[PDB]
Short mmCIF file of C-alpha atoms in Angstrom, two decimals:
data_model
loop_
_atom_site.label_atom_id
_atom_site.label_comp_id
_atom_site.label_asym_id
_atom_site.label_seq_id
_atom_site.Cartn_x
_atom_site.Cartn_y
_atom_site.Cartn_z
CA UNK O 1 -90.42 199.19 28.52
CA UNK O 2 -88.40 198.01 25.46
CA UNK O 3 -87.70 194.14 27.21
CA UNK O 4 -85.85 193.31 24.16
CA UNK O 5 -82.43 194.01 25.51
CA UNK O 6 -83.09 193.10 28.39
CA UNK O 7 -81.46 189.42 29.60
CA UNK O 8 -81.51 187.34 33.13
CA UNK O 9 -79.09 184.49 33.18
CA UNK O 10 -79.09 182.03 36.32
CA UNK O 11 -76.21 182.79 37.88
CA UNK O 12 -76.23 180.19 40.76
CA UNK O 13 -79.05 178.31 42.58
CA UNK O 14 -79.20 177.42 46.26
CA UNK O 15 -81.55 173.85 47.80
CA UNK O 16 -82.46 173.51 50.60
CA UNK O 17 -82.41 169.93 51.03
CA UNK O 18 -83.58 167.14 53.08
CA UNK O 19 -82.32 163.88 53.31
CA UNK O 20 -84.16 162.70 56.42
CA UNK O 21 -81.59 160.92 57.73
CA UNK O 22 -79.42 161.91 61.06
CA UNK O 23 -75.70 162.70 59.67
CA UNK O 24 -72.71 162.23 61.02
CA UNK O 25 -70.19 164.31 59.73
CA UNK O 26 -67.19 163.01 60.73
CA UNK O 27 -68.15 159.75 58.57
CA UNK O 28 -70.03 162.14 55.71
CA UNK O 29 -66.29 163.82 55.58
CA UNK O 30 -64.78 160.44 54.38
CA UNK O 31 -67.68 161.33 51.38
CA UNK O 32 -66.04 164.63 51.09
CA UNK O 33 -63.31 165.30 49.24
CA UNK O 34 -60.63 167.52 51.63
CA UNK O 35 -63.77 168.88 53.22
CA UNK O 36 -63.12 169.67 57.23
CA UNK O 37 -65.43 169.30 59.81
CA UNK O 38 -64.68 172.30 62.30
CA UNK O 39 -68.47 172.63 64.23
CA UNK O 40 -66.91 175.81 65.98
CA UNK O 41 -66.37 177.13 62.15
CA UNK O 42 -69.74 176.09 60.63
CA UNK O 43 -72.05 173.25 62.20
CA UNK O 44 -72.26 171.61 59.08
CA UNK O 45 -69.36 170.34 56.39
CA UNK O 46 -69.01 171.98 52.95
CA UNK O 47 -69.10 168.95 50.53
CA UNK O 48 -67.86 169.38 47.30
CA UNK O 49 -69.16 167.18 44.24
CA UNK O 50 -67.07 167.71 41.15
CA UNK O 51 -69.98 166.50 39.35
CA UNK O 52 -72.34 168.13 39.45
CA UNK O 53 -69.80 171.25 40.48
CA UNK O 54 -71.69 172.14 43.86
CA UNK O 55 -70.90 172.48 47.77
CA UNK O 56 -73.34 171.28 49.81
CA UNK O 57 -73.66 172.17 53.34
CA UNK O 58 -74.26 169.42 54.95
CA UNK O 59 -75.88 169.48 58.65
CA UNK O 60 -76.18 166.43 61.03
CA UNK O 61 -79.75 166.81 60.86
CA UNK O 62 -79.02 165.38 57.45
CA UNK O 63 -80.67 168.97 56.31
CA UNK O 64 -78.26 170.27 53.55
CA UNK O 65 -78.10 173.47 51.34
CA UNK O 66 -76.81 172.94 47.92
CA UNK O 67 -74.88 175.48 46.72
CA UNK O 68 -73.21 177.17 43.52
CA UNK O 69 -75.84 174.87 41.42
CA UNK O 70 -75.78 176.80 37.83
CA UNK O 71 -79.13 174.37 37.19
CA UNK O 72 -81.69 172.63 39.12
CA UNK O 73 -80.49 169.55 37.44
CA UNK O 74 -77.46 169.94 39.04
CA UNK O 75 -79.19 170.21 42.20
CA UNK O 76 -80.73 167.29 41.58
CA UNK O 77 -77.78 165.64 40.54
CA UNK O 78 -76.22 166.78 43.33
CA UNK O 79 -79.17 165.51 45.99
CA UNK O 80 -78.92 162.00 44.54
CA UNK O 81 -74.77 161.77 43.77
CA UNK O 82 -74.74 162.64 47.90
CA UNK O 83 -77.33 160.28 48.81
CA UNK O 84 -75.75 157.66 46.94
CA UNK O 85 -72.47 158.58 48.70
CA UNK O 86 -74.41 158.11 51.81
CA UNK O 87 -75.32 155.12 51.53
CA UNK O 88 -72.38 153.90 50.66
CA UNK O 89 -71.63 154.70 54.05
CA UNK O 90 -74.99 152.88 55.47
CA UNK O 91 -77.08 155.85 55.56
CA UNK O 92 -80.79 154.91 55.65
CA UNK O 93 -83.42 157.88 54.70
CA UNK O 94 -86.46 158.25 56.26
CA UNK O 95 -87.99 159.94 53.63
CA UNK O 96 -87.14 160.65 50.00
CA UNK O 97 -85.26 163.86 50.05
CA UNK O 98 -87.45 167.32 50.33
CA UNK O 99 -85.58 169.50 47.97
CA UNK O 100 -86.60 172.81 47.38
CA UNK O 101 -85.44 175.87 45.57
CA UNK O 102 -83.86 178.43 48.23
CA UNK O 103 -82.62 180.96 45.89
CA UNK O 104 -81.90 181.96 42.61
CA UNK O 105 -79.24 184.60 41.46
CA UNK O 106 -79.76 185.93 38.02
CA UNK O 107 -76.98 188.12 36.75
CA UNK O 108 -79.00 190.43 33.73
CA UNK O 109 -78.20 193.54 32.00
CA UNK O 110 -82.00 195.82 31.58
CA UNK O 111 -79.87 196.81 28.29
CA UNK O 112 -79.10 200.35 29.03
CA UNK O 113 -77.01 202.69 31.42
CA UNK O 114 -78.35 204.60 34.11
CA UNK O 115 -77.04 207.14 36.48
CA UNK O 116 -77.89 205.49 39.89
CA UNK O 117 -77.93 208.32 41.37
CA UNK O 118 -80.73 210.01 39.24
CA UNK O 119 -82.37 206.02 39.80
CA UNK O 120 -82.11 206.24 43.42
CA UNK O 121 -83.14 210.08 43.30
CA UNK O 122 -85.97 208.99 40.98
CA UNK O 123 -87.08 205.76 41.94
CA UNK O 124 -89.19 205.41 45.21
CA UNK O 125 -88.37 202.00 46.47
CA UNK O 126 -84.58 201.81 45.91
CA UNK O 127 -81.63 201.84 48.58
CA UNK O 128 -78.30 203.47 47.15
CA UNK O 129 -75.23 204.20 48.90
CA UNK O 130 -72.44 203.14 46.88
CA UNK O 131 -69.71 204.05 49.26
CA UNK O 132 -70.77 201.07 50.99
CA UNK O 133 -72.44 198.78 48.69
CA UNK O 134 -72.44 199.20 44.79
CA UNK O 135 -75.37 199.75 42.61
CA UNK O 136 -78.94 200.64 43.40
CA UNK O 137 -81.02 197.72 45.72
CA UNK O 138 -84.29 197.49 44.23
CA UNK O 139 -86.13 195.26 46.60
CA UNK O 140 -89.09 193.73 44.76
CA UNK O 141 -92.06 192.98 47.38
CA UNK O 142 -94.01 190.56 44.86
CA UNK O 143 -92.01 188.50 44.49
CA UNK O 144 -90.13 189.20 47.43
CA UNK O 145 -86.77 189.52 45.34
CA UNK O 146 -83.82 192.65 45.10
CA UNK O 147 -82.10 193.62 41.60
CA UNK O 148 -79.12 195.55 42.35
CA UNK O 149 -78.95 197.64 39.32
CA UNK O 150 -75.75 199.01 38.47
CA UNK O 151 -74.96 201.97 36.16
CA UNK O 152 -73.91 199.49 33.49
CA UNK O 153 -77.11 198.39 33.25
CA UNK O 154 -76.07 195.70 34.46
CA UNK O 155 -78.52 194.23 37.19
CA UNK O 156 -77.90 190.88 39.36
CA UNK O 157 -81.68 189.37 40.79
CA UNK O 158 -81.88 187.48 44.17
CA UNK O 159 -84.19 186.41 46.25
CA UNK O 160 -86.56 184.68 43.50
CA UNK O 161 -87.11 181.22 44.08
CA UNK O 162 -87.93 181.43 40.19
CA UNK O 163 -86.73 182.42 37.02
CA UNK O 164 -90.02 183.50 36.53
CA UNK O 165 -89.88 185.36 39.55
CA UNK O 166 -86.87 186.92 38.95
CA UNK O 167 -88.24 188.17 35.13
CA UNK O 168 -91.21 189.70 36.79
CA UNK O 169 -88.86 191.35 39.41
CA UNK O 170 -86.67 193.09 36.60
CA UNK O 171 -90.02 193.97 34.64
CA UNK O 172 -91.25 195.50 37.73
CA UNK O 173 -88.16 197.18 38.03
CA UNK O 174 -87.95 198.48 34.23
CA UNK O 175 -91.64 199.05 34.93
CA UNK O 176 -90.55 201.45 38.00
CA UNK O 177 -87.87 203.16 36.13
CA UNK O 178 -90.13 203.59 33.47
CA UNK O 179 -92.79 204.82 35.29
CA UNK O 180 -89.82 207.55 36.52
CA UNK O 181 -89.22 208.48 33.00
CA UNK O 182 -85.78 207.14 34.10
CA UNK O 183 -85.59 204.68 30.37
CA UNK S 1 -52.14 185.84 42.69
CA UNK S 2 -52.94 186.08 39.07
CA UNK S 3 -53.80 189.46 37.60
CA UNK S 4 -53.79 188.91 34.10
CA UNK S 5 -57.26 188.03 33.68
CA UNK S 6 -58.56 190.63 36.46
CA UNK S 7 -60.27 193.15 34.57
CA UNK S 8 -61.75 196.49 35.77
CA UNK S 9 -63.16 198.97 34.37
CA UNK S 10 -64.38 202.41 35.28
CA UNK S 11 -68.20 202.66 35.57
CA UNK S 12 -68.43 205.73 37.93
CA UNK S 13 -66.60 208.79 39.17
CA UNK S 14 -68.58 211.07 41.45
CA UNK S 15 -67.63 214.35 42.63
CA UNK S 16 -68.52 216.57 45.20
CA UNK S 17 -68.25 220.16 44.55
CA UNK S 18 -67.91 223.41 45.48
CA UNK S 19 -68.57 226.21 43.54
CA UNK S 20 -68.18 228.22 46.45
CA UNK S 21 -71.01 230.01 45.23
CA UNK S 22 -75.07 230.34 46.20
CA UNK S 23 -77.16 228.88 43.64
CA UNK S 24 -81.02 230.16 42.57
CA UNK S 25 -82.24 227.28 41.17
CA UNK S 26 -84.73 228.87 39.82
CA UNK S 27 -82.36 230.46 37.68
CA UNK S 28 -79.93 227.42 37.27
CA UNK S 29 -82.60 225.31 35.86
CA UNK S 30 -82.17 226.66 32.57
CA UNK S 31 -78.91 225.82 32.24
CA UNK S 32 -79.76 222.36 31.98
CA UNK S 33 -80.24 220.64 28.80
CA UNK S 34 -82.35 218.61 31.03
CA UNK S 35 -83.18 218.07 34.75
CA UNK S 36 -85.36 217.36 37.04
CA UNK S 37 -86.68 219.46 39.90
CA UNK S 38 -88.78 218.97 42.57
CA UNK S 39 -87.68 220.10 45.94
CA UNK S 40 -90.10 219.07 47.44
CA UNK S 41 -88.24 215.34 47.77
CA UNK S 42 -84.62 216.71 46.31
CA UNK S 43 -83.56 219.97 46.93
CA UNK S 44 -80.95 219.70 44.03
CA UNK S 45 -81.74 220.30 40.66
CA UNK S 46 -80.90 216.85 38.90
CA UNK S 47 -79.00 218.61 35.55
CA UNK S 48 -78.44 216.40 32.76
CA UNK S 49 -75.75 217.43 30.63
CA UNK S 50 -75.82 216.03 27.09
CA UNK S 51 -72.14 216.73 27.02
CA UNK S 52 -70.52 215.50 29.24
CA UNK S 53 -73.52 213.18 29.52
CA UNK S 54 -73.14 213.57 33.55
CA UNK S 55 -76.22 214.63 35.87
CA UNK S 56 -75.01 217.17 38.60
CA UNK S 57 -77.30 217.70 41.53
CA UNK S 58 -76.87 221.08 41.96
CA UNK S 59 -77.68 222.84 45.13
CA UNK S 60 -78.46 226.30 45.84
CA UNK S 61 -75.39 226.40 48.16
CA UNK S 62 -73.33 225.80 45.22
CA UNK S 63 -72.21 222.45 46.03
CA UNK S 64 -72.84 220.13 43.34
CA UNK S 65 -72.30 216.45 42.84
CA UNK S 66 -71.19 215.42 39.42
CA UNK S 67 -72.61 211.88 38.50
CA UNK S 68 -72.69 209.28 35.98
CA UNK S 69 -69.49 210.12 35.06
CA UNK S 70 -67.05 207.88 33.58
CA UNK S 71 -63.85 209.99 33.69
CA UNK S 72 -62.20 212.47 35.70
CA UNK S 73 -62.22 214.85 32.79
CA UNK S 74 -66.29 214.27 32.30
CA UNK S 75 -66.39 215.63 35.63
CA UNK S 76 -63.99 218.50 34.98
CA UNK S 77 -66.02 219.31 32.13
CA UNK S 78 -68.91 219.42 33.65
CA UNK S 79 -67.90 221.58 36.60
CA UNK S 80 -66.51 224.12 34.47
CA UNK S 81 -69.86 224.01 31.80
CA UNK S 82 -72.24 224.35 34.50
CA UNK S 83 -69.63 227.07 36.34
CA UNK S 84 -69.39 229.18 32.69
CA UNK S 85 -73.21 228.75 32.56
CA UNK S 86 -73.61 229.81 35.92
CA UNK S 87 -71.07 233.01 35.27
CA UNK S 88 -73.88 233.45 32.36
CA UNK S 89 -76.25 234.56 34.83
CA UNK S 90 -74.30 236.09 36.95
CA UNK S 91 -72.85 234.52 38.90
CA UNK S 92 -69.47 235.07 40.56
CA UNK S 93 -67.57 232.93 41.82
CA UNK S 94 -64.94 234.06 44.57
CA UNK S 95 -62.79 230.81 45.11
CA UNK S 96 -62.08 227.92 43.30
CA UNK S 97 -64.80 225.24 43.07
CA UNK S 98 -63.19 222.26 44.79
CA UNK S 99 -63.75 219.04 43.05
CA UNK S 100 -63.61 215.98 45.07
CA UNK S 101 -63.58 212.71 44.11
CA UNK S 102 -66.00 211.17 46.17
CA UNK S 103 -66.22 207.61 44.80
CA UNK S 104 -65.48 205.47 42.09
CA UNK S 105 -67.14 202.39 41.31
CA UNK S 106 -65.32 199.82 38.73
CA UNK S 107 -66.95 197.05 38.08
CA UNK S 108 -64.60 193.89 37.02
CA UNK S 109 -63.76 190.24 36.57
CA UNK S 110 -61.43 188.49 38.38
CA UNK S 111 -62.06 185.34 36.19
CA UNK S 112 -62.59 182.57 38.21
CA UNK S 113 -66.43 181.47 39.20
CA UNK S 114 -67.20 181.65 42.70
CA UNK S 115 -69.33 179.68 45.05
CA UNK S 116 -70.22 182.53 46.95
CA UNK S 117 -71.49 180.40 49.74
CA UNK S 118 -68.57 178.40 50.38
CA UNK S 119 -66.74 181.92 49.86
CA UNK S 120 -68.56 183.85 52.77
CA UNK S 121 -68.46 181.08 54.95
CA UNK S 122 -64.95 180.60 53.96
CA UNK S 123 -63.64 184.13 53.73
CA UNK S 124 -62.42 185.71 57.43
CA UNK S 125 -64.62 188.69 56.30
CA UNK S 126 -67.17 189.42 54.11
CA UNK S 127 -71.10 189.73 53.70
CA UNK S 128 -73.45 187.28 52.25
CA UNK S 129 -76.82 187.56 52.84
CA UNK S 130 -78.28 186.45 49.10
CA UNK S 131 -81.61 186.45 50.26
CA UNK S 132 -80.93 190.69 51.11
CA UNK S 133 -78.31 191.37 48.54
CA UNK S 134 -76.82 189.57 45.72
CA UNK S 135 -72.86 188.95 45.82
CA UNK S 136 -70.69 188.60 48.37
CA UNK S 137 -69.37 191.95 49.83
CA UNK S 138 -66.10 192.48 50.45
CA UNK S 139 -64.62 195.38 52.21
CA UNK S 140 -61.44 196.83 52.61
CA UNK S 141 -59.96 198.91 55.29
CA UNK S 142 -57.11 200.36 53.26
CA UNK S 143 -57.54 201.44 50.87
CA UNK S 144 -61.22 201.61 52.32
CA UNK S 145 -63.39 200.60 49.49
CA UNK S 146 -66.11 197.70 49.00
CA UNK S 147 -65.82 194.90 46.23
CA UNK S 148 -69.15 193.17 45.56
CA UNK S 149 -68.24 189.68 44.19
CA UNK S 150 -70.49 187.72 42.36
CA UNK S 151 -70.42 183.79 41.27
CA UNK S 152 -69.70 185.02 37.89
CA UNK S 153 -66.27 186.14 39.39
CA UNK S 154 -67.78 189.04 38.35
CA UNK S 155 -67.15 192.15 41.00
CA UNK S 156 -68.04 195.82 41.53
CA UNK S 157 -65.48 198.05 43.31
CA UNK S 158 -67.16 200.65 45.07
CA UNK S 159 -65.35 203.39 47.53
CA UNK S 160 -62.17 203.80 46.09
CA UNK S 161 -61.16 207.33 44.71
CA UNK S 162 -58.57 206.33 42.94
CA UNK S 163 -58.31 203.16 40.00
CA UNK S 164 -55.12 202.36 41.33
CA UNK S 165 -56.64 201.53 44.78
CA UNK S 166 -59.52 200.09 43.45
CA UNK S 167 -56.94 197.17 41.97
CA UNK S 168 -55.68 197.14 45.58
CA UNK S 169 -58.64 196.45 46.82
CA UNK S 170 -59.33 193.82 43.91
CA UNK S 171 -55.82 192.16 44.77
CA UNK S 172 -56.53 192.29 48.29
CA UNK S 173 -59.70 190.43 47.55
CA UNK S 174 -57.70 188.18 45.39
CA UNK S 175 -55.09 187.99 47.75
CA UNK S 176 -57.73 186.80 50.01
CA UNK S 177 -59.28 184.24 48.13
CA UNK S 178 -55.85 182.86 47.57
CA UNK S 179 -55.21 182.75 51.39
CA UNK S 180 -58.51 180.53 51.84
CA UNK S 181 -57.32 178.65 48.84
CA UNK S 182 -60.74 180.17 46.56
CA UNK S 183 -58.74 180.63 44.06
#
C-alpha cells in the first residue's frame, strides 16, 4: 500500500461527559443560548457554546455528550466553559468531570478512485448498496471502526475513539483492498 | 435557500443492461482488457475496460451492469464496445440492449459545516447512527434518492437517476435544514 496519498482529517469528535452533578434543565437553559427544553423531543437540551463551537447534550443526570468538537481541546474547552456556566447557576459537582472520547469522524481520501462495485465485489468484509446508502461500509473489527469508501477515494472513518485508531482502520482497509489486488 | 455554493458533482452512473442476448463467459472473458472471474462468488465477469475506464459485470444472460462510470456517454460507450466485441464472437443480438440508468451517486458540498448531532436530532427525518455509519442520511421520497451529509457539509447523493433530481434532493435537504433553521 502506497500510504503516501493517503490523508485522515478529524472531522468532528463526540464526549461523553460527566459532570456528576443532577441537572436541571430548565435552569441549565438560562446557560443556553435559544436552546429549548422539549423532554418529549429529546430528554436532554442541546447547548450551544460559541466558543468552543460545540452542542452539548445535556441530560439531567448532568451526563452530557459533546458534540461537533473539531478537537479534543475543544472538548475540553467545552467541559469546563459549561461547568463554569453551571456554577454560575450554583451547580455543585460531585466529582471532577469523566470525559471521554465517544467518537471520532475522520473524513480521508486513500488517494485513488475505485469502482465500489468491483470493491464490494472484491472485498470480503464490505456492505454496498448505494441505492440506499452511498459508498462501500468497510466495518473494521480491530478497532471496531467503519470507513465508508466512496469511488472518489474519498473515505470518511467512524467509530474510532482514536486517530490512531482510525489510521489503522484505513490501513487495514488499503491493506484489504490491496490484498484484493483492488490498488 | 442558498445554492450558489452547493456543489455536486458526478461520481457514478450505473447502468443496467440488456443485451438481450446469452452470454458464454467463457468466451466473453477475452474481450476484456481486464476482469475478474470467479463464479464461484460472482457469476459476472467483472470487465475492466481501459476505455471507457468502466467495469461491466457481465452475465451470461446478457444483462450487464456498467460501473464506475462517470458519464452517460462512458456507459454508452461501453455498452456498445463490449456489444461490437461480443458481435466479434458471434454473437447476435436480436433487440436493442436497454440501458438503464440505475443510479447515480454525486457527491457535493453544500458549504456550511454541520453538527450532525444536533442535525439528526433536529431534522424530522434522517439517520445518524455514527457509531454504524458516518454522516447523517438523508432520504428523499421524491425524487427518491439518499443524501449522506457529513459535518464537512460535505454530502453524497445516492439514488437519483438523473443530476437534475439529485439537486432536488440536495435542495430538499437544504430546504430542510433551512426549515429547522441548520442553515
Amino acid at each position: 500500500v502506497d500510504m503516501s496519498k493517503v490523508k485522515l482529517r478529524i472531522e468532528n469528535i463526540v464526549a461523553s461527559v460527566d459532570l456528576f452533578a443532577q441537572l436541571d434543565l430548565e435552569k441549565v437553559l438560562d446557560l443556553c443560548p435559544n436552546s429549548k427544553y422539549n423532554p418529549e423531543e429529546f430528554p436532554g437540551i442541546i447547548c450551544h457554546l460559541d466558543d468552543p463551537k460545540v452542542a452539548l447534550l445535556i441530560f439531567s443526570s448532568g451526563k452530557l455528550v459533546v458534540t461537533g468538537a473539531k478537537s479534543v481541546q475543544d472538548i475540553e474547552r467545552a467541559v469546563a466553559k459549561l461547568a463554569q456556566k453551571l456554577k454560575s447557576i450554583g451547580v455543585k459537582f460531585k466529582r471532577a468531570p469523566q470525559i471521554d472520547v465517544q467518537n471520532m469522524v475522520f473524513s480521508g481520501d486513500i488517494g485513488r478512485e475505485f469502482n465500489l462495485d468491483v470493491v464490494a465485489l472484491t472485498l470480503p468484509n464490505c456492505e454496498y448498496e448505494p441505492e440506499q446508502f452511498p459508498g462501500v461500509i468497510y466495518r473494521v473489527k480491530e478497532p471496531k471502526s467503519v470507513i465508508l469508501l466512496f469511488s472518489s477515494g474519498k473515505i470518511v472513518c467512524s467509530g474510532a475513539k482514536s486517530e490512531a485508531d482510525a489510521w489503522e482502520a484505513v490501513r487495514k482497509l488499503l491493506r484489504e483492498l490491496d490484498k484484493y489486488g483492488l490498488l
